[PDB]
């Protein structure tokens, strides 16, 4: 009905929604709210929604909020500013996705050239990666 013409009132709806929304339903509301702030709002507001989204959405889909935040920061501030939100992810999402984030993070640091940082990503992931079954991780580190 209004788009951006009532945005400060629109924010109050989304905040009033998310102030009581449970974390099983909040996934769509956060992405809808970020779309508003993306197309009409200030940039750090959209990023703050994603920063909320990757902790307010339940664990079973929290990785799907982190990679949004990764993509959107990377899309505007590049891979250098992207680093700190990988380290949040690796420390927080469950171990199967924490490996996956570690492989993706090490790929960036090698494609940049921070080879010493790349090792510490692998070496930190390697303690939660049983070589008797997770053989594809140890292959990527071996390569």
């Amino acid at each position: 009905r209004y788009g951006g013409k009532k945005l400060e009132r629109a924010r109050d709806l989304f905040e009033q929604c998310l102030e009581n929304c449970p974390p099983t339903h909040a996934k769509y509301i956060f992405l809808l709210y970020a779309k508003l702030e993306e197309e009409h709002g200030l940039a750090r507001h959209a990023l703050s929604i994603y920063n909320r989204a990757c902790s307010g959405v339940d664990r079973a889909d929290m990785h799907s909020m982190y990679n949004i935040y990764i993509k959107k920061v990377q899309e505007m501030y590049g891979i250098a500013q992207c680093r700190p939100i990988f380290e949040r992810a690796i420390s927080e999402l469950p171990e199967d996705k924490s490996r996956a984030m570690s492989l993706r993070y090490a790929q960036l640091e090698t494609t940049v050239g921070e080879i010493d940082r790349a090792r510490a990503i692998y070496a930190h992931a390697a303690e939660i990666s049983d070589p008797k079954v997770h053989v594809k991780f140890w292959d990527t580190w071996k390569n």
């Binding site: 009532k6 400060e8 009132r9 109050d12 200030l42 750090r44 507001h45």
Partner: protein, 574 residues
């Protein structure tokens, strides 16, 4: 493993008158356990319980009486002594036990609960009332009065339960929730005139100077739920008018619930703006350097067309948050507070003298020696081109060159002087510009471009002649590119030929030799291209064949253009 647990521990996982005489043995056990260890109160309960189980109620009584001589403050003994009497239907004994318990330990709720409950279950409810009344005479905790209220309500004695509340607030009135619970009770029984009076008395009790938000919110939401919406709105507005905004967050959120339903658009947006202004003002006090709170707050106040003095004042508060760093990175976001302030003062307030003071105050704040923003100097220069004061704009922009030569400052000043049609001025500025960065080959092009744009074909040749003599350009190929382009475009092809070969004295790069031959192709003097290839053949014989192959096949391209069946073998035999 071998043994350490799953054997050595596991192997040790495992390895008539005769009734009357049993009674005598049990009392021997119990009574000597007592002699051995009084204060083991569980033995006295078991012994007293056991005499009950044998039906020896009179013995059981004396045992509990002897237990109470050892510890009269044990609530367990009084309750177990009480429960055994009422198990045995000894209601007058049980009543005497409870009267003693509540007499001796009036603060132990368990006796009052169990006693009044027993007297209720036994349907002596005026006996139960007097027990609760006697309890309330000790001014007991809040939880005690609730059980008396609940007692009266379970018999639907609403006016009785009302009287307990009115006594309850004389004792525990300090807890606002007791006051709200009463008004909920009066409301839920439909005594809405009493519920309203209860909230009004609450405000009176806690004091209409030391105003309490929880009463206001509860009272306002009550009137809302009674459809007294103009009173509900009244109570919220009175709250916001009389309380500091570090409280009132509950009053606000509920007011922007009440108004957001029961209000109307002009009211709904008014309260949300006032909420947001309060919200930004808070998160500014939390940090100050939360520039995005300022940029929102300033935008909000501008968007709502708020009065100039207040928009101007908040800008001054924004501006005081100077970054604590000498590094341009932190200023890059900050500086748009200043720019927007000037834009507001020029566009919205339309007070250009004040706008000038904004721009001036930028330049007094930026360090300039460590870094500069060309943004502010360009904007302040163009602000003085507006109002038709180029004599000020030149002074502003010339000091920018003076304090801090920077490429966008030169470019923007030159562009201004071009638009003014002041060709003498920008020529002098280019000379200063090239003196400021003589390696900036791209600017040598734009200086020579100006000379060609003015049509002074002699001026431009001299610039290029000086340019190619300057060592250590950023990228000479781009200068030679422009100069050959110019030397072609003025039809001085004999000088362009001269110019091309006087490049070749400094390079034997394969693609330059290809382009030299390709130049002769575009002249239509393909004989010049041929000996360019023959020169690139019979003088670079030390060049490796895998590099030469790119140039030998460039002549092949020239001869497939030419079609000379005899020339291809000349291309082939090299």
């Amino acid at each position: 493993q071998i043994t350490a647990e799953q054997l050595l521990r596991e192997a040790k996982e495992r390895e008539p008158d005769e009734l009357k005489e049993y009674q005598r043995k049990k009392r021997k056990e119990f009574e000597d356990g007592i002699r051995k260890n009084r204060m083991q109160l569980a033995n006295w309960i078991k012994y007293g319980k056991w005499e009950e189980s044998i039906g020896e109620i009179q013995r059981a009584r004396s045992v509990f009486e002897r237990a109470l001589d050892v510890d009269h403050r044990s609530i367990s003994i009084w309750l177990q002594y009480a429960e055994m009497e009422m198990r045995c239907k000894q209601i007058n004994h049980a009543r005497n036990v409870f009267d003693r318990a509540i007499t001796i330990m009036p603060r132990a709720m368990q006796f009052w609960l169990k006693y009044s409950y027993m007297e209720e279950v036994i349907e002596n409810i005026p006996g139960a009332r007097q027990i609760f009344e006697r309890w309330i005479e000790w001014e007991p905790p809040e939880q005690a009065w609730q059980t008396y209220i609940n007692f009266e309500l379970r018999y639907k004695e609403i006016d009785r339960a009302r009287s307990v509340y009115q006594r309850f607030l004389h004792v525990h009135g300090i807890n606002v929730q007791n006051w709200i619970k009463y008004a909920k009770f009066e409301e839920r029984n439909g005594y809405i005139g009493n519920a309203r009076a209860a909230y009004e008395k609450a405000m009176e009790y806690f004091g209409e100077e030391d105003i309490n938000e929880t009463v206001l919110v509860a009272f306002a939401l009550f009137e809302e739920r009674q459809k007294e919406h103009e009173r509900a709105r009244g109570i919220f507005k009175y709250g916001l008018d009389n309380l500091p905004s570090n409280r009132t967050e509950e009053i606000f959120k509920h007011y922007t619930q009440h108004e957001k339903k029961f209000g109307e658009r002009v009211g709904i947006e008014d309260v949300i703006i006032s909420k947001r202004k309060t919200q930004y003002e808070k998160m500014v006090e939390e940090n100050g350097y939360n520039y995005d709170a300022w940029f929102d707050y300033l935008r909000l106040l501008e968007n709502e067309e708020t009065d100039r003095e207040e928009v101007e004042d908040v800008y001054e508060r924004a501006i005081a948050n100077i970054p604590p760093h000498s590094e341009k990175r932190y200023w890059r976001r900050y500086i748009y507070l200043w720019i927007n302030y000037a834009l507001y003062e020029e566009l919205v307030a339309k007070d250009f003298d004040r706008a000038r003071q904004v721009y001036k105050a930028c330049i007094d704040i930026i360090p300039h020696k460590t870094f500069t923003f060309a943004k502010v100097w360009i904007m302040f220069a163009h602000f003085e081109i507006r109002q038709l004061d180029l004599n000020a704009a030149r002074k502003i922009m010339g000091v920018a060159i003076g304090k801090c030569p920077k490429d966008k400052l030169f470019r923007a000043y030159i562009d201004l002087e071009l638009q003014l049609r002041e060709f003498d001025r920008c020529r002098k500025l280019y000379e200063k510009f090239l003196e400021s960065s003589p390696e900036s080959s791209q600017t040598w092009i734009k200086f020579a471009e100006l000379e060609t744009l003015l049509g002074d074909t002699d001026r431009s040749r001299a610039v290029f002649t000086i340019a190619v003599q300057q060592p250590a350009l950023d990228m000479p190929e781009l200068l030679w590119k422009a100069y050959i382009d110019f030397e072609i475009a003025c039809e001085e092809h004999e000088k362009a030929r001269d110019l091309y070969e006087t490049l070749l004295q400094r390079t034997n790069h394969i693609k330059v030799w290809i382009s030299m031959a390709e130049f002769e192709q575009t002249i239509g003097n393909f004989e010049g291209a041929r000996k360019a290839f023959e020169r690139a053949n019979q003088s670079l014989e030390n060049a490796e064949k895998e590099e030469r192959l790119m140039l030998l096949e460039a002549w092949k391209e020239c001869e497939t253009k030419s079609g000379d069946q005899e020339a291809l073998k000349r291309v082939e035999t090299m």
